[PDB]
């Protein structure tokens, strides 16, 4: 009996503490204007037994399955806000993504919802993993897609987001001896992606430096002479991995292939 009206003083600060932890700075003037019927009533200094009272006396919302309904579209907003972490997400997009997230049919069966799961997949993967060439390249591509969420968000249609989902989730997949195939997904990516470098602002610079000796030294066994091994250590001086320092290695793999047969 005041067990349930407990629990609905719960939820009401749950409610409140998600949208602190979203907003402490006030900005998103329309979300918490969905919520100010609940957020009221932890931005004044009401005591625990008022609240609960005003839940028996029906002065609050206190129908507890209502409120865990709109608690978990906010759970899932503030998901999307820590999962492309360390980017941000500006303001009136993140209240235009939660307005997606209210009016979906069914959100737990959506593609907002399966994005966000696979996206910390991902992530949570990435915690512990070895700095291998897979992991490297895969840790460059989930960085670039939190940033592409943060500026396009995660319900409209995207086939750069969809292919940065299908190429990560390609490379956790690929077993750790299939080096070609770990590199040709990824040289593929970036040749076909619109940016010229699409690394920078997103990897540190150390990263990128790591990526283009990964690129030089991949290649390097295959040349058949100093001249071709010479214009490849050239192209190390780089310090960001580029579209055009991608087709300067295959042009002298291409010239590689006149010195066999």
């Keep these: ?16 503490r998600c949208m602190q932890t979203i907003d402490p ?16 009533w932890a931005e004044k200094n009401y005591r625990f037994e008022e609240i609960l009272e005003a839940s028996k006396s029906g002065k609050c919302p206190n129908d507890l399955d209502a409120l865990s309904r709109r608690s978990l579209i906010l759970q899932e907003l503030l998901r999307l806000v820590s999962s492309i972490s360390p980017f ?4 009136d997009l993140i209240e235009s993504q939660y307005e997606k997230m209210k009016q979906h049919v069914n959100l737990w069966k959506s593609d907002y919802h399966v994005k966000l799961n696979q996206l910390n997949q991902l992530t949570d993967y990435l915690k512990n993993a070895a700095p291998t ?13 939190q940033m592409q969420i943060a500026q396009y968000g995660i319900t409209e ?23 070609d195939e770990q590199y040709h997904l990824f040289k593929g ?24 000796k990964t690129m030089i030294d991949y290649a390097m066994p295959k040349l058949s002479s100093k001249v071709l091994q010479d214009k490849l250590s050239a192209l190390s001086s780089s310090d960001v991995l580029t579209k055009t320092l991608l087709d300067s290695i295959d042009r002298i793999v291409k010239e590689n292939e006149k010195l066999n047969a």
């Design 133 to 145: 060439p897979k992991n490297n390249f895969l840790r460059a591509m989930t960085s670039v897609l």
């Design 88 to 91: 941000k997400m500006k303001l």
């Design 189 to 212: 990516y970036v040749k076909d992606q619109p940016e010229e470098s699409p690394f920078e602002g997103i990897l540190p610079a150390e990263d990128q430096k790591i990526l283009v």
């Design 25 to 40: 700075e006030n900005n998103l003037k329309k979300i918490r204007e969905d919520y100010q019927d609940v957020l009221i």
């Design 157 to 179: 249609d995207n086939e750069g987001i969809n292919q940065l989902f299908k190429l990560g989730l390609h490379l956790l997949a690929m077993a750790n001896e299939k080096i």
């Design 1 to 16: 009996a005041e067990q349930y009206h407990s629990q609905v003083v719960g939820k009401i600060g749950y409610i409140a």
